Design a protein around this ligand. Structure first.
Ligand SMILES: [Ca+2]
Ligand SMILES: [Ca+2]
Ligand SMILES: [Cl-]
Ligand SMILES: [Cl-]
Ligand SMILES: [Cl-]
Ligand SMILES: [Cl-]
Ligand SMILES: [Cl-]
Ligand SMILES: [Cl-]
Ligand SMILES: [Cl-]
Ligand SMILES: [Mg+2]
Ligand SMILES: [Mg+2]
Lengths: 571, 549
């Protein structure tokens, strides 16, 4: 393994143990964003050059999917070397340069790190199968039979015949929860635990701001269990958090656990220490419920998942995003016993058609601009830290035929020029082609075309992000659902607890009202506790009538929404 | 159709995918009824026989080469009744139909395999090749070496290993079981009874395995092929068997069978190295890669015929044929950046030639005048492009581009429901490349291609004539005569991008008048002095050698 010493490191931002609670994340693939060297493939230097756009957009942290050395048989989630970037993307030094440049603009970077397994091309595995009594002999999970752990499901049931695969060289079976070319690491071997902690430290020494830890529920296996969410798995996660907070204060760990929210709460750790595992975890059912709330023109699927979500440690934060599937497994989270909408998804033909396929926001919503704004408003005002996916801010489409994941991984559309301005290479050499249809194609949909008009989706999104950044209640406020006469309208207030040396718009309460119906709707709200306050609409700053003792009437167009600052009255 | 045991020697074939040609029912997928509705186009183009890749019921994990039921049409294409409708409509127009039939293996979803694994003591227990170990047949290479760790896979239900030369979801049939041989003969008869004109038999070199061998081309494999030919000969005279053997031509001749009988296995087999050699001949501006491959091809039985096509890869395995010992061009392909970029990917003719119309015409002229029965691939006649990102095979399987309308006129469905999207780029997109746009001008690639087919059809020499390479002063020009005995044709082809002169010794035909076949202009009669022909870069001429009064 390389040592971090022989590379540069990035200059660390000032320590801020709460930064991730206030952050808007931007998931961007290195391969897709910008090709600076005309090989048809996006690269680290290209991403570095585009930091000006990212800063202008106003996001706080980049989230990079895996960019490590890999044969790319499973999208790069099959890792061949944890210490090396895929050569086509650049080198470790290019990553340090990117980190420094990002940090200069106050922008942080996290990346995906797959903890559960490596590619079978990883040298640990080649040594494990060729030299069984060597130091890597027990780095993986080996057996003379395929009978162990029978209660564990096969995740990729239509592709893999078993969770055990017979290796022709070692003549024993090895365990894999994912594809056969992704052998599971043996976490019962303390050398494996130390090796993986050393991986985290390598990137942290370089200066990375954190990781999304992938496939963590599957680390340990035990007979008599379904081999997910085991005590020893959480124990290892506590080691990661301990190392993180002791040696690198102010960094973050995000858990990718595609489970019902009550079940992922455990991944934040012990409530009594304030949380001692992951700082963040994703709330996967939110988008499916929002999607269904709109289809149904009813607030309840949204009201319900929020009400039923258990409280989490003070230190912790949910991550939220506008996708219906986990990118690792392409599964939508559900629960037969605890999801009242369990059987309802299969009854919606749009939902049904896209089962197991990642889709971008605009295509999910049939390019309806009003709905894109509504879903985006919800993403930016509901509790949690939001993740925007690259290209959704201009309304990019997808290309489903490229694959279940690759559908959403086509080049960023910068201009209406050749290759959408992503590359100077010949089109036949692009890693994937840009969208070329009349609706989503780069001749029509690109950054340059949207920069001019204040009314473009890009400019609208950038303004919404700016507004959000100026109001703390969106990031760390309480959540109070207001109910109301009309079931088609979701209304809530978010409040800051307010301690010492504050008082201003930044800490004033906020009121959000969202119409899930396609038709204009009235709603009368009981806001009597805020009698005398003045609702000020956030985008145009117009003062609405002061709140009284009577119900407050707001009227919304189809799929419309309003955000108001609740200003304290003048004495 | 009235029996005509030589029809395949005179045929031009047209490989057309049911899924890609025409969607008549607006589900976004091409279908048999749709293909039937486009037969007038196929007749007008002038081809003689359709070649349909597998259209059987299948989970489509390996492009439909993974068959779930040999007796059933994939439901989205229609049913056996739609297939008979297609057959009758084609025959009415004098067009025949052959199809791919995978003989070596089935999908693991096939009911035979599910019975084999669940009920080992039952009648299907020995329908596949099972073993307690993965040690047998170690000399057989793994075809898909980057994907399959072994030719043996452990089945979790039966708890034994089964053999597969292809992907793990394609278990090999056990041809040492006599019931397997009878079941597969019965598949042949089922489609022949419906009226199909023949089959391309796929993966046949791999039927039998034997210890101490590489498990290809075994004598028992050829013995089973003889059973297939005999069944055809005895029960369905006038039908054809084509072999898909991606091997050096010398090795392929075995698939025509015993020369002493006039051939007792396949009627046809493919000459795979032809396109790679033509491609390199043009890259090097030398006739030699073509001259040599033809000269080194052994004689085949007189009732047999080579099939030829303008592709560098076999569609089953995505491999280009070669031979370390017998191919002088063996190390040369890797030195060509065009060949190197496209390794393991099917590409259409226009993209292979960077859309150079002169070269498209040159390669097509060679395809239509060299010895063998040519196969045209659907869409090449209008210059369609491909979409490589769709997959190594799906690259060339996008919808036929009929018009510049929505979905290229292939379907009325919404674009997001199409099985694959049409080309949409500035060069190959359906807004500029489509049948409708080319129908009008006599100078379109489509009308040029149609005219060349019409010309070829009027000269038996192209189909069954002898082949005499004329040599000549200039190594950049390939000249030859095709002759049958009363019909003699002279073909001259410029492999150089620049204009070239060639002086030919045509003394044997002195007095004859060369008549150029497209404009019918009479050229100077052949004398005792060498005949000078001058060609533009990548040009060609076809001449009928007419007897003097
Ligand atoms: Ca594990
Ligand atoms: Ca076999
Ligand atoms: Cl990437
Ligand atoms: Cl995800
Ligand atoms: Cl999704
Ligand atoms: Cl098909
Ligand atoms: Cl059927
Ligand atoms: Cl082929
Ligand atoms: Cl090809
Ligand atoms: Mg690049
Ligand atoms: Mg159809």
């Amino acid at each position: 393994h390389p040592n971090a010493e022989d590379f540069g490191h990035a200059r660390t931002l000032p320590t801020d143990t709460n930064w991730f609670k206030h952050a808007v994340f931007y998931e961007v693939l290195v391969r897709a964003f910008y090709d600076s060297n005309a090989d048809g493939i996006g690269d680290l230097r290209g991403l570095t050059e585009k930091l000006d756009y990212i800063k202008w957009l106003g996001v706080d942290c980049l989230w990079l999917p895996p960019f490590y050395d890999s044969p790319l048989r499973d999208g790069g989630y099959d890792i061949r070397d944890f210490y090396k970037v895929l050569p086509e993307f650049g080198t470790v030094d290019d990553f340090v340069t990117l980190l420094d440049a990002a940090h200069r603009r106050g922008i942080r970077i996290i990346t995906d790190l797959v903890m559960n397994h490596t590619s079978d091309q990883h040298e640990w595995f080649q040594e494990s199968r060729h030299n069984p009594d060597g130091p890597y002999g027990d780095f993986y999970v080996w057996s003379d039979t395929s009978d162990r752990y029978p209660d564990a499901r096969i995740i990729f049931v239509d592709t893999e015949e078993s969770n055990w695969t017979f290796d022709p060289v070692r003549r024993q079976f090895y365990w894999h929860r994912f594809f056969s070319h992704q052998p599971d690491l043996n976490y019962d071997n303390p050398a494996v635990q130390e090796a993986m902690l050393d991986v985290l430290r390598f990137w942290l020494d370089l200066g990375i701001d954190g990781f999304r830890l992938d496939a963590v529920p599957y680390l340990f296996e035990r007979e008599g269990t379904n081999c997910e969410n085991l005590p020893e798995t959480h124990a290892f996660l506590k080691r990661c958090r301990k190392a993180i907070d002791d040696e690198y204060p102010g960094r973050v760990l995000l858990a990718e656990a595609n489970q019902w929210p009550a079940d992922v709460v455990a991944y934040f750790g012990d409530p009594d220490t304030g949380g001692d595992e992951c700082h963040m975890a994703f709330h996967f059912p939110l988008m499916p419920r929002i999607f269904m709330a709109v289809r149904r023109e009813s607030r309840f699927p949204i009201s319900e998942i929020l009400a039923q979500t258990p409280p989490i440690p003070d230190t912790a934060q949910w991550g939220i995003f506008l996708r219906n599937h986990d990118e690792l497994t392409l599964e939508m989270v559900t629960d037969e016993e605890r999801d009242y909408m369990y059987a309802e998804y299969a009854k919606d033909p749009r939902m049904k058609a896209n089962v197991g396929i990642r889709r971008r926001l605009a295509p999910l919503l049939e390019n309806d601009r009003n709905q894109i704004e509504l879903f985006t408003a919800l993403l930016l005002s509901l509790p949690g830290s939001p993740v925007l996916y690259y290209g959704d801010e201009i309304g990019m489409g997808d290309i489903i035929w490229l694959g279940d994941r690759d559908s959403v991984r086509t080049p960023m559309q910068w201009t209406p020029d050749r290759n959408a301005g992503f590359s100077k290479a010949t089109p036949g050499r692009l890693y994937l082609p840009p969208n070329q249809d009349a609706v989503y194609g780069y001749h029509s949909v690109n950054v340059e075309a949207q920069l001019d008009s204040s009314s473009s989706l890009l400019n609208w999104t950038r303004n919404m992000l700016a507004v959000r950044s100026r109001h703390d209640a969106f990031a760390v406020g309480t959540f109070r659902e207001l109910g109301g006469s009309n079931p088609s309208v979701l209304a809530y207030i978010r409040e800051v607890t307010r301690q010492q040396g504050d008082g201003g718009a930044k800490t004033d309460a906020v009121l959000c009202v969202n119409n899930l119906s396609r038709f204009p709707q009235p709603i009368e709200l009981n806001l009597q506790q805020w009698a005398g306050y003045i609702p000020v609409e956030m985008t145009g700053y117009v003062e609405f009538p002061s709140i009284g003792q009577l119900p407050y009437l707001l009227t919304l167009p189809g799929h419309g929404f309003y955000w108001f600052q609740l200003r304290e009255p003048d004495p």
